[PDB]
Design an enzyme around this catalytic site. Sequence first.
Site, mmCIF file in Angstrom:
data_model
loop_
_atom_site.group_PDB
_atom_site.id
_atom_site.type_symbol
_atom_site.label_atom_id
_atom_site.label_comp_id
_atom_site.label_asym_id
_atom_site.label_seq_id
_atom_site.Cartn_x
_atom_site.Cartn_y
_atom_site.Cartn_z
ATOM 1 N N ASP A 35 -3.631 -3.655 9.192
ATOM 2 C CA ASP A 35 -2.446 -3.934 8.645
ATOM 3 C C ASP A 35 -2.499 -5.263 7.709
ATOM 4 O OD1 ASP A 35 0.320 -4.428 8.367
ATOM 5 O OD2 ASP A 35 0.487 -4.737 10.464
ATOM 6 N N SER A 199 6.249 -7.192 -8.758
ATOM 7 C CA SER A 199 6.041 -6.435 -9.734
ATOM 8 C C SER A 199 6.925 -6.674 -10.729
ATOM 9 C CB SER A 199 6.579 -5.032 -8.818
ATOM 10 O OG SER A 199 6.520 -3.855 -9.778
#
Length: 330
Positions: A35, A199
Amino acid sequence: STGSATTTPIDSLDDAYITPVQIGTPAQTLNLDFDTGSSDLWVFSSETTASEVDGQTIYTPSKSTTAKLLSGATWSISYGDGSSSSGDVYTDTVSVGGLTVTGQAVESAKKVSSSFTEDSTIDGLLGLAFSTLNTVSPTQQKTFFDNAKASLDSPVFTADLGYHAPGTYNFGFIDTTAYTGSITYTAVSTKQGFWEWTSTGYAVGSGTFKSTSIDGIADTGTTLLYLPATVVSAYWAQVSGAKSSSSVGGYVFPCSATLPSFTFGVGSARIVIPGDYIDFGPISTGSSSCFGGIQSSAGIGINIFGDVALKAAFVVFNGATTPTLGFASK
Protein backbone atom coordinates in the site's frame (compact mmCIF):
# COMPACT_ATOMS: atom_id res chain seq x y z
CA SER A 1 20.57 -6.09 -2.83
CA THR A 2 17.30 -6.44 -4.69
CA GLY A 3 13.94 -8.13 -4.25
CA SER A 4 11.25 -9.21 -6.72
CA ALA A 5 7.83 -10.57 -5.80
CA THR A 6 4.72 -11.37 -7.77
CA THR A 7 1.56 -9.53 -6.80
CA THR A 8 -1.79 -11.18 -7.54
CA PRO A 9 -5.33 -9.78 -7.76
CA ILE A 10 -7.49 -11.01 -4.89
CA ASP A 11 -10.54 -11.44 -7.12
CA SER A 12 -11.85 -11.19 -10.66
CA LEU A 13 -12.25 -7.39 -10.39
CA ASP A 14 -8.72 -6.54 -9.20
CA ASP A 15 -10.25 -5.09 -6.01
CA ALA A 16 -6.78 -5.38 -4.45
CA TYR A 17 -3.49 -7.17 -4.92
CA ILE A 18 -1.69 -9.49 -2.52
CA THR A 19 2.01 -10.15 -2.37
CA PRO A 20 3.60 -12.97 -0.33
CA VAL A 21 5.80 -11.79 2.53
CA GLN A 22 8.03 -13.95 4.73
CA ILE A 23 7.91 -12.96 8.42
CA GLY A 24 9.92 -14.51 11.21
CA THR A 25 12.12 -17.54 11.73
CA PRO A 26 11.18 -20.05 10.47
CA ALA A 27 9.40 -18.05 7.82
CA GLN A 28 5.70 -17.43 8.19
CA THR A 29 4.35 -16.44 4.79
CA LEU A 30 1.48 -13.95 4.81
CA ASN A 31 -0.19 -12.40 1.78
CA LEU A 32 -0.05 -8.66 2.25
CA ASP A 33 -1.59 -5.71 0.47
CA PHE A 34 1.31 -3.49 -0.58
CA ASP A 35 0.00 0.00 0.00
CA THR A 36 1.88 3.08 -1.24
CA GLY A 37 -0.81 5.18 0.47
CA SER A 38 0.03 4.15 4.05
CA SER A 39 3.10 3.40 6.11
CA ASP A 40 2.25 0.60 8.55
CA LEU A 41 3.16 -3.05 8.07
CA TRP A 42 0.44 -4.80 10.02
CA VAL A 43 -0.72 -8.39 10.08
CA PHE A 44 -3.48 -10.62 11.28
CA SER A 45 -1.95 -12.50 14.16
CA SER A 46 -2.32 -14.86 17.07
CA GLU A 47 -3.34 -11.77 19.05
CA THR A 48 -6.22 -10.81 16.77
CA THR A 49 -9.64 -11.03 18.40
CA ALA A 50 -10.77 -14.50 17.34
CA SER A 51 -14.22 -13.40 16.10
CA GLU A 52 -12.48 -10.91 13.80
CA VAL A 53 -10.42 -13.59 12.05
CA ASP A 54 -12.20 -15.42 9.23
CA GLY A 55 -9.84 -17.33 6.98
CA GLN A 56 -6.74 -15.13 7.09
CA THR A 57 -3.29 -16.52 7.68
CA ILE A 58 -1.99 -15.25 11.00
CA TYR A 59 1.45 -14.31 12.24
CA THR A 60 2.30 -16.05 15.51
CA PRO A 61 5.25 -14.21 17.01
CA SER A 62 5.73 -16.78 19.75
CA LYS A 63 6.70 -19.27 17.03
CA SER A 64 9.36 -16.96 15.60
CA THR A 65 12.80 -17.18 17.19
CA THR A 66 13.66 -13.71 15.86
CA ALA A 67 10.48 -11.96 17.05
CA LYS A 68 10.92 -9.45 19.87
CA LEU A 69 8.11 -7.48 21.49
CA LEU A 70 8.68 -3.77 20.98
CA SER A 71 7.99 -2.84 24.54
CA GLY A 72 5.29 -0.25 25.04
CA ALA A 73 4.58 0.26 21.35
CA THR A 74 1.03 0.36 20.05
CA TRP A 75 -0.49 1.27 16.73
CA SER A 76 -3.88 2.30 15.44
CA ILE A 77 -4.83 3.30 11.94
CA SER A 78 -7.95 4.46 10.12
CA TYR A 79 -8.17 4.30 6.34
CA GLY A 80 -10.01 6.48 3.84
CA ASP A 81 -12.83 3.94 3.43
CA GLY A 82 -13.57 3.98 7.15
CA SER A 83 -11.82 0.71 7.90
CA SER A 84 -9.38 0.40 10.78
CA SER A 85 -7.07 -1.84 12.77
CA SER A 86 -4.89 -1.58 15.87
CA GLY A 87 -2.62 -3.56 18.14
CA ASP A 88 0.91 -3.92 19.44
CA VAL A 89 4.31 -4.26 17.78
CA TYR A 90 7.07 -6.79 17.31
CA THR A 91 10.32 -6.47 15.46
CA ASP A 92 11.20 -9.44 13.30
CA THR A 93 12.86 -10.45 10.07
CA VAL A 94 10.79 -9.64 7.01
CA SER A 95 11.61 -10.73 3.48
CA VAL A 96 9.99 -9.76 0.20
CA GLY A 97 10.96 -11.52 -3.00
CA GLY A 98 14.43 -12.41 -1.69
CA LEU A 99 15.05 -9.03 -0.04
CA THR A 100 15.51 -9.26 3.72
CA VAL A 101 15.12 -6.63 6.44
CA THR A 102 16.06 -7.48 10.01
CA GLY A 103 14.41 -5.61 12.86
CA GLN A 104 11.35 -4.62 10.82
CA ALA A 105 8.44 -3.34 12.87
CA VAL A 106 5.68 -5.91 12.41
CA GLU A 107 2.46 -4.47 13.75
CA SER A 108 0.34 -7.22 15.27
CA ALA A 109 -3.40 -6.65 15.04
CA LYS A 110 -5.46 -7.07 18.21
CA LYS A 111 -8.49 -5.56 16.50
CA VAL A 112 -9.54 -5.19 12.86
CA SER A 113 -12.73 -3.69 11.42
CA SER A 114 -15.33 -5.75 9.62
CA SER A 115 -14.11 -5.09 6.08
CA PHE A 116 -10.74 -6.67 6.94
CA THR A 117 -12.38 -9.66 8.66
CA GLU A 118 -14.66 -10.13 5.66
CA ASP A 119 -11.72 -10.24 3.27
CA SER A 120 -10.19 -13.66 3.78
CA THR A 121 -7.53 -13.10 1.10
CA ILE A 122 -5.68 -10.23 2.76
CA ASP A 123 -3.51 -11.15 5.75
CA GLY A 124 -2.39 -7.58 6.38
CA LEU A 125 -0.93 -4.47 4.75
CA LEU A 126 2.63 -3.48 3.96
CA GLY A 127 2.86 0.28 3.80
CA LEU A 128 5.13 1.95 1.26
CA ALA A 129 4.28 5.62 1.75
CA PHE A 130 6.67 7.75 3.75
CA SER A 131 7.53 6.72 7.28
CA THR A 132 6.27 10.04 8.63
CA LEU A 133 2.73 8.55 8.39
CA ASN A 134 3.60 5.48 10.45
CA THR A 135 1.18 5.22 13.38
CA VAL A 136 3.37 3.42 15.93
CA SER A 137 3.48 5.20 19.28
CA PRO A 138 5.40 6.40 21.19
CA THR A 139 8.27 5.62 18.82
CA GLN A 140 7.34 5.95 15.17
CA GLN A 141 8.65 3.10 13.00
CA LYS A 142 10.11 2.89 9.51
CA THR A 143 8.56 1.20 6.48
CA PHE A 144 10.03 -1.90 4.96
CA PHE A 145 11.29 0.19 2.04
CA ASP A 146 12.84 2.78 4.35
CA ASN A 147 14.65 0.03 6.27
CA ALA A 148 15.83 -1.69 3.07
CA LYS A 149 16.82 1.46 1.21
CA ALA A 150 20.48 1.76 2.11
CA SER A 151 21.04 -1.90 1.18
CA LEU A 152 19.35 -1.67 -2.21
CA ASP A 153 21.36 -1.41 -5.41
CA SER A 154 19.26 1.65 -6.19
CA PRO A 155 16.91 3.36 -3.70
CA VAL A 156 13.73 2.53 -5.61
CA PHE A 157 10.86 0.16 -5.83
CA THR A 158 8.56 -0.38 -8.80
CA ALA A 159 4.92 -1.33 -9.10
CA ASP A 160 3.81 -3.28 -12.14
CA LEU A 161 0.19 -4.22 -11.48
CA GLY A 162 -1.62 -6.54 -13.82
CA TYR A 163 -5.06 -6.13 -15.33
CA HIS A 164 -6.94 -9.26 -14.37
CA ALA A 165 -3.49 -10.85 -14.06
CA PRO A 166 -0.46 -11.11 -11.81
CA GLY A 167 2.21 -8.43 -11.78
CA THR A 168 5.36 -7.55 -9.95
CA TYR A 169 6.81 -5.46 -7.15
CA ASN A 170 10.56 -4.95 -7.53
CA PHE A 171 12.89 -3.47 -4.95
CA GLY A 172 16.24 -1.95 -5.73
CA PHE A 173 16.25 -2.08 -9.53
CA ILE A 174 14.33 -1.06 -12.63
CA ASP A 175 13.48 -3.94 -14.94
CA THR A 176 14.01 -2.35 -18.33
CA THR A 177 12.16 -5.26 -20.01
CA ALA A 178 8.97 -4.51 -18.09
CA TYR A 179 7.90 -1.38 -19.95
CA THR A 180 7.80 0.19 -23.38
CA GLY A 181 9.31 3.47 -24.43
CA SER A 182 10.88 5.60 -21.72
CA ILE A 183 10.08 6.33 -18.10
CA THR A 184 8.87 9.89 -17.49
CA TYR A 185 9.78 11.20 -14.09
CA THR A 186 7.76 13.79 -12.24
CA ALA A 187 8.18 15.72 -9.00
CA VAL A 188 6.92 14.44 -5.67
CA SER A 189 5.81 16.29 -2.60
CA THR A 190 6.29 14.38 0.63
CA LYS A 191 4.64 17.10 2.73
CA GLN A 192 1.54 14.94 3.39
CA GLY A 193 3.56 11.72 3.66
CA PHE A 194 2.29 10.43 0.30
CA TRP A 195 3.76 9.86 -3.14
CA GLU A 196 2.04 13.06 -4.17
CA TRP A 197 2.52 14.41 -7.68
CA THR A 198 0.83 16.57 -10.30
CA SER A 199 -0.63 15.10 -13.42
CA THR A 200 -0.55 17.42 -16.42
CA GLY A 201 -4.08 16.65 -17.57
CA TYR A 202 -6.41 14.14 -19.16
CA ALA A 203 -8.33 12.95 -22.17
CA VAL A 204 -11.49 10.89 -22.52
CA GLY A 205 -11.46 8.24 -25.21
CA SER A 206 -10.21 9.69 -28.47
CA GLY A 207 -10.97 13.20 -27.26
CA THR A 208 -8.54 16.08 -27.13
CA PHE A 209 -6.14 16.31 -24.24
CA LYS A 210 -7.07 18.85 -21.59
CA SER A 211 -4.01 20.47 -20.08
CA THR A 212 -4.74 20.99 -16.42
CA SER A 213 -2.83 20.31 -13.20
CA ILE A 214 -4.26 17.51 -11.11
CA ASP A 215 -2.52 17.01 -7.76
CA GLY A 216 -2.92 13.46 -6.50
CA ILE A 217 -1.28 10.47 -4.87
CA ALA A 218 0.06 7.29 -6.35
CA ASP A 219 -1.74 4.76 -4.17
CA THR A 220 -1.48 1.03 -4.81
CA GLY A 221 -3.74 0.44 -1.79
CA THR A 222 -6.74 2.14 -3.38
CA THR A 223 -8.71 0.24 -6.00
CA LEU A 224 -10.17 3.02 -8.09
CA LEU A 225 -9.18 6.29 -9.70
CA TYR A 226 -10.53 9.28 -7.76
CA LEU A 227 -10.42 12.59 -9.59
CA PRO A 228 -12.13 15.99 -9.46
CA ALA A 229 -15.86 16.03 -10.16
CA THR A 230 -15.37 18.05 -13.36
CA VAL A 231 -13.04 15.42 -14.81
CA VAL A 232 -15.17 12.49 -13.71
CA SER A 233 -18.33 14.09 -15.12
CA ALA A 234 -16.56 14.63 -18.45
CA TYR A 235 -15.62 10.95 -18.51
CA TRP A 236 -19.02 9.45 -17.68
CA ALA A 237 -20.81 11.86 -20.02
CA GLN A 238 -19.34 9.74 -22.83
CA VAL A 239 -21.09 6.60 -21.55
CA SER A 240 -24.73 6.36 -22.48
CA GLY A 241 -26.87 5.80 -19.41
CA ALA A 242 -24.11 6.51 -16.91
CA LYS A 243 -25.13 8.40 -13.82
CA SER A 244 -24.01 9.24 -10.32
CA SER A 245 -26.01 7.24 -7.80
CA SER A 246 -25.99 8.40 -4.18
CA SER A 247 -27.67 5.13 -3.19
CA VAL A 248 -24.87 3.10 -4.72
CA GLY A 249 -22.24 5.68 -3.77
CA GLY A 250 -20.79 6.69 -7.11
CA TYR A 251 -21.04 6.55 -10.87
CA VAL A 252 -22.76 3.48 -12.27
CA PHE A 253 -23.25 2.58 -15.90
CA PRO A 254 -25.11 0.02 -17.98
CA CYS A 255 -23.19 -3.24 -17.94
CA SER A 256 -23.90 -3.44 -21.70
CA ALA A 257 -21.68 -0.44 -22.35
CA THR A 258 -18.30 -0.37 -23.94
CA LEU A 259 -16.27 2.09 -21.91
CA PRO A 260 -13.98 4.73 -23.43
CA SER A 261 -10.37 4.87 -22.39
CA PHE A 262 -9.03 7.50 -20.01
CA THR A 263 -5.68 9.16 -20.54
CA PHE A 264 -3.70 10.96 -17.86
CA GLY A 265 -0.66 13.14 -18.32
CA VAL A 266 2.75 12.63 -16.77
CA GLY A 267 4.71 15.65 -17.86
CA SER A 268 4.62 15.55 -21.65
CA ALA A 269 3.92 11.79 -21.64
CA ARG A 270 0.56 10.06 -21.61
CA ILE A 271 -0.71 6.94 -19.86
CA VAL A 272 -3.78 5.34 -21.42
CA ILE A 273 -6.17 3.40 -19.19
CA PRO A 274 -8.19 1.09 -21.44
CA GLY A 275 -11.96 1.31 -21.00
CA ASP A 276 -12.15 -2.28 -19.79
CA TYR A 277 -9.98 -1.33 -16.77
CA ILE A 278 -12.76 1.03 -15.63
CA ASP A 279 -15.47 -1.68 -15.39
CA PHE A 280 -15.93 -2.99 -11.83
CA GLY A 281 -18.92 -5.12 -12.61
CA PRO A 282 -22.48 -5.40 -11.34
CA ILE A 283 -23.28 -3.28 -8.29
CA SER A 284 -24.90 -6.40 -6.85
CA THR A 285 -24.97 -9.97 -8.06
CA GLY A 286 -27.07 -10.28 -11.20
CA SER A 287 -27.56 -6.53 -11.62
CA SER A 288 -27.23 -4.94 -15.05
CA SER A 289 -25.95 -1.74 -13.42
CA CYS A 290 -22.16 -1.75 -13.22
CA PHE A 291 -19.87 0.21 -10.94
CA GLY A 292 -17.45 2.71 -12.45
CA GLY A 293 -13.72 2.59 -11.90
CA ILE A 294 -13.37 6.37 -12.14
CA GLN A 295 -15.06 8.20 -9.29
CA SER A 296 -15.20 11.67 -7.82
CA SER A 297 -12.66 12.66 -5.18
CA ALA A 298 -14.98 15.40 -3.94
CA GLY A 299 -15.28 14.92 -0.20
CA ILE A 300 -12.17 12.68 -0.02
CA GLY A 301 -10.05 15.80 0.05
CA ILE A 302 -7.39 14.37 -2.23
CA ASN A 303 -7.20 12.92 -5.74
CA ILE A 304 -6.07 9.29 -5.78
CA PHE A 305 -4.33 7.55 -8.61
CA GLY A 306 -5.30 4.09 -7.42
CA ASP A 307 -4.91 0.71 -9.07
CA VAL A 308 -7.16 1.58 -12.04
CA ALA A 309 -4.58 4.17 -13.06
CA LEU A 310 -1.40 2.54 -11.83
CA LYS A 311 -2.08 -0.85 -13.45
CA ALA A 312 -1.95 0.90 -16.88
CA ALA A 313 1.68 1.84 -16.17
CA PHE A 314 5.06 0.71 -14.99
CA VAL A 315 5.56 2.93 -11.94
CA VAL A 316 8.85 3.85 -10.31
CA PHE A 317 8.77 4.97 -6.72
CA ASN A 318 12.13 6.69 -6.51
CA GLY A 319 13.23 7.09 -2.89
CA ALA A 320 16.36 9.11 -3.59
CA THR A 321 17.13 12.03 -1.27
CA THR A 322 14.66 13.99 -3.37
CA PRO A 323 11.93 11.49 -4.17
CA THR A 324 10.32 11.33 -7.59
CA LEU A 325 7.77 9.17 -9.42
CA GLY A 326 8.32 7.61 -12.82
CA PHE A 327 5.67 6.33 -15.22
CA ALA A 328 6.08 4.29 -18.39
CA SER A 329 3.59 2.61 -20.66
CA LYS A 330 3.84 -1.16 -20.85
